[PDB]
Amino acid sequence: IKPDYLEYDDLLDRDEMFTILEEYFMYRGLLGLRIKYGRLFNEIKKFDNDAEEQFGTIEELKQKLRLNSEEGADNFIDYIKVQKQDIVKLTVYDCISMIGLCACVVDVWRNEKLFSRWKYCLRAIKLFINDHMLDKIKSILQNRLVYVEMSKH
Amino acid sequence: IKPDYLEYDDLLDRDEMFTILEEYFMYRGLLGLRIKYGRLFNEIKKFDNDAEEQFGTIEELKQKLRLNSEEGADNFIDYIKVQKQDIVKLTVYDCISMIGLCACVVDVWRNEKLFSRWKYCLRAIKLFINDHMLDKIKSILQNRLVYVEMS
């Protein structure tokens, strides 16, 4: 039995990166951010700054992708597919931004009470981020948490 | 890719009973009941009446098990185990009541904001309800979706 990552402060080798993301999008997509999260989720939450810098503001995407419309989730998927196409050589930082983007998008859906749409973030991650990139993200989060430890003490 | 069951109105052979329960406890345990549910979840929601009749009120269970305490989830699991060892011959209706019981319990945890504890309901289901009983429950829910239409 694996741990619950909502209030998890670590990221060990035994922890699966995708599962962390599954729970992250479930919890953020259903409960939102006004909740106690652990150091782990708190790090992933910072991916939001990246996403805005790379893909634009959520207010813009919301209008352009018509996120809250019936075709909103399908549009988001096509948009993600378009992003993956258009980027010349994908870096781990693209993948990080992309996650932050999903997070911001899931916020829009939660507020609209389209609660089942958090699933689409996972579908998008699967399309955008391969196992090799998930490893690199996990390695980065592990480093970032080690520094958060130093900062604390 | 399987469907999302939050607003699902059916229950087909291809739908796995455990997965339905996974999502049910996730959604009820995190969002609660003031949400649009499909006919499927609405049926499982009725398991609540069963649970009260068989295991007692949630107010009492909450006090007896001290559900919101640090040991609350472990206590609930113990409770489930005890109840199972105790039942001479387990019926599908015992399993149904037990699910309703988990549902009522998850409500307590949600209100306390112990949001990760919904997982324990699944752990409890796995202990209490074998695949054979899950099939019988699925069969009943399939009938009930029909019975409801009739009415």
Author numbering:
A (entry chain A): 40 to 192
B (entry chain B): 40 to 190
Paper text:
Vaccinia virus, the vaccine used to eradicate smallpox, has about 200 genes, and many of these encode proteins that help the virus evade the host's immune defences. This paper concerns the vaccinia virus proteins A52 and B14, which block signalling pathways leading to the activation of the NF-κB transcription factor and thereby diminish the host immune response to infection. The structures of A52 and B14 are entirely α helical, both comprising seven α helices and adopting the Bcl-2–like fold. We show that both proteins are Bcl-2 family members but lack a surface groove for binding BH3 peptides and, consonant with this, are not anti-apoptotic. Instead these proteins have acquired the ability to inhibit signalling pathways that activate NF-κB.
A52R is an immediate-early VACV gene encoding a 23-kDa intracellular protein (A52) that contributes to virus virulence. A52 functions by inhibiting NF-κB activation downstream of the IL-1 receptor and TLRs via interactions with IRAK2 and TRAF6. The structures of two independent crystal forms of an N-terminal truncated form of A52 comprising residues 37–190 (A52ΔN36) were refined to 1.9 Å and 2.8 Å resolution with residuals R/Rfree = 0.177/0.215 and 0.181/0.192, respectively, with residues 40–189 being observed in electron density maps in both crystal forms. Residue 190 and the first two residues of the polyHis purification tag were also visible in the low-resolution structure. Both crystal forms of A52 contain 2 molecules per asymmetric unit arranged as a dimer, the overall fold (0.32±0.07 Å root-mean-squared displacement [rmsd] over 150 Cα atoms) and dimer interface being highly conserved. The final 46 residues, removed in the A52ΔC46 truncation mutant that abolished TRAF6 binding and the ability to stimulate p38 MAP kinase, comprise the final 6 residues of helix 5 and all of helices 6 and 7. Given that helices 5 and 6 contribute to the central core of the protein, it is unclear whether this truncated protein would be stable and natively folded let alone whether it would dimerise like the native protein (900 Å2 of the 1,300 Å2 of surface area buried by the native dimer interface being abolished by the truncation). Further study is therefore required to identify the binding face of TRAF6 on the surface of A52. Superposition of our structures onto that of myxoma virus M11 in complex with the BH3 peptide of Bak reveals the hydrophobic BH3-peptide binding grooves are occluded in both A52 and B14, but not in N1. Residues 92–94 and 117–122 block the groove in A52, the C-terminal ends of helices 2 and 4 being oriented closer to each other than in M11, thereby narrowing the groove significantly, and the side chains of Q93, F94 and Y118 pointing directly into and filling the groove.
